Amino acid sequence: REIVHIQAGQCGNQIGAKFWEVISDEHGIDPTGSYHGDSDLQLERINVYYNEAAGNKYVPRAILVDLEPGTMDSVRSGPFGQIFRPDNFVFGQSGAGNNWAKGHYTEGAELVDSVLDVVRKESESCDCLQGFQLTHSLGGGTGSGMGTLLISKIREEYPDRIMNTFSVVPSPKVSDTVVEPYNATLSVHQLVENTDETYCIDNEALYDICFRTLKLTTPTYGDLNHLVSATMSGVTTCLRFPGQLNADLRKLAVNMVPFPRLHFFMPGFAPLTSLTVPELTQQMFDAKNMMAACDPRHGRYLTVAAVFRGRMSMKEVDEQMLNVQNKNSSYFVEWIPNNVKTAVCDIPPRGLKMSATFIGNSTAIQELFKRISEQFTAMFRRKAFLHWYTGEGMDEMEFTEAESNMNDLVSEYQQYQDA
């Protein structure tokens, strides 16, 4: 029915910025101006992602948050910099963090209200608010710590509506901080409690896709974001476009998450880099093509949701889609009936004549949580860099309490490879 979009912390801001300019050109929107493009559809549900202001203009329902100016002015003087509403930006000024604590308590709390009070304006402006979606990183802190806070404070003011996040889980390769595992674990715990669905964009997976399968040597933060950015458009398509489903985003939740513990989705895309259909499915269901460092093999799928794109015959899709869960019919939990649903839309993405994307609630995701909990208990062992948080006000046992909650999540996913 209508969604607001919070976007916070260097990674989040950069990630979402590409998202925005990517869907904007899908809908045919200028840096400010409105429509331009012989298509007609687009506008039906443009409502959903764009509160529209004075005259023509389209301005996205987006809130921009950070704890240091730089990253924001990167957007303003950038791609679709002019597009966002001016007093929708919320600067930080003070020290960033790159330490959870700072963002979820001290330098964080400081801002919260001034952001919360702007989401409050956007929301109450909405004719019928569907929920919020936020982009941020789990490592570092100006969005992994303020973010998990922002959401802890959205529920409470909005228990009602649902919480959606795209969270980049960090890795040992392509990382700026030794502490990431601390920041990661500390958030994972928070996400588990206050969100309905969370998409995992693993940076380990991400790097692997660029170099391990794309000849791209030094992977910028750039061609890497291009992956996430394309994936994110694929994942939302059905809520921003046709008249096939409609996607209550709550329907999406009620149908993808069998168990309360908000289960985390691993996404996957069809063609890539900066397509026969049988060729498209074979790829979209390949580990070598997941957005999270996992491998659905070492684990069953709870429920899967796939969404195609471009002029192609569903007759073939429904056929191939059955042919996957057959040549692989052991990897689809049999205690949940028609647990794999496919949606087709006919408006091609950027370049690409054909395209597909994939959403998967798979117990293999366990693998991901295990590997961050591996460098965590591997450092919190002989209390590592911990004194950086102790100092900002946190308690020693708030770490064990997080670690403990997290391992259960592994001990639950591993419980459902049952029968």
């Binding site: 309360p260 208990t377 919190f380 064990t400 309490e401 670690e403 403990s404 909650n405 259960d408």
Partner: protein
């Protein structure tokens, strides 16, 4: 793991409304449900179903009799240094509180009291005298994922869990008792400020300590009705409880199972489940639900 069922007699209200008693317990381990049914053509018949438990108590069984075959055999477990738990499970009005806390009111007539009585008797026995143990008691309730100290005026407590995963309930008040009359005073106090009717989980504990260390612990639990969307927390806890108990003889966590975690993980731990049943025809679907849950629990023995 021991699983029992207890049928309570029809009360005044039910008899007055002319409720039919559809429960029979023909032997000490067999419970019969005379389920009323209609054929497609509206013909009335009975599908008499049979359930077997370690112990099945009929409407004439008193709390002392029930206690003797359920929690009594677990007291020794704490003196042997183990962790015991006894749960009262069933539908609203089935007799859970009446069994654990006293008739209604009268603390002395309930399992919490009776168990305490035997704890003082055993500690004074030669085989245990030389243990030099001190007896402590606690009483708390769990409501909507929140823990409240019933011996410290519903004070809301915090529950933390390190990485090693043991849980600790910060602030829970432990009271020293040296007499059954002491325990009865803490039970009255706690029951007087509990959130009769379910809505919470009640948990009265008896701890044994010697020197900085916990010797043994017995957790007596008065569960919330098994039949305002808080029923989600109640159902998750009950689902969680079942898997924890079954994991004992071999998740999707909840507060209840988090707090009682250490009582299911040890190798020297025992549990008893008492399923309460309201005998009325109008409660037949609630009864079958209680019985089938019970079946799956004992299924792990």
């Amino acid at each position: 793991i021991c699983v029992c069922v207890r049928k309570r007699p029809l009360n005044k209200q039910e008899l007055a409304k002319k409720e039919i008693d559809v429960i029979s317990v023909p032997s000490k381990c067999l419970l019969l449900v005379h389920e009323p049914k209609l054929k497609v053509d509206l013909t009335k018949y009975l599908e008499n179903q049979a359930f077997c438990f370690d112990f099945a108590f009929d409407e004439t069984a008193s709390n002392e009799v029930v206690y003797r075959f359920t929690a009594r055999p677990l007291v020794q477990t704490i003196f042997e240094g183990g962790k015991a738990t006894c749960f009262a499970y069933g539908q609203t009005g089935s007799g859970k509180t009446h069994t654990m806390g006293g008739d209604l009111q009268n603390a002395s007539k309930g399992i919490y009291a009776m168990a305490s009585r035997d704890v003082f008797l055993l500690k004074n026995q030669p085989r245990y005298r030389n243990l030099n143990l001190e007896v402590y008691v606690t009483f708390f309730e769990i409501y909507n994922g929140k823990v409240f100290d019933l011996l410290n005026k519903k004070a809301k407590l915090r529950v933390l869990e390190d990485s090693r995963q043991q849980v600790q309930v910060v602030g829970l008040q432990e009271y020293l008792v040296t007499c059954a009359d002491d325990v009865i005073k803490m039970i009255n106090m706690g029951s007087a400020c509990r959130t009769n009717s379910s809505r919470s989980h009640a948990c009265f504990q008896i701890l044994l300590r010697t020197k900085g260390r916990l010797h043994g612990k017995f957790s007596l639990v008065d569960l919330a009705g098994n039949e305002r969307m808080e029923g989600a927390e109640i159902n998750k806890s009950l689902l969680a409880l079942k898997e924890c108990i079954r994991a004992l003889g071999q998740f999707r966590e909840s507060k209840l199972t988090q707090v009682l975690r250490d009582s299911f993980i040890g190798e020297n731990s025992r549990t008893c489940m008492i399923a309460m049943i309201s005998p009325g025809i109008s409660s037949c679907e609630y009864t079958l639900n209680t019985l089938r849950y019970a079946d799956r629990v004992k299924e792990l023995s």
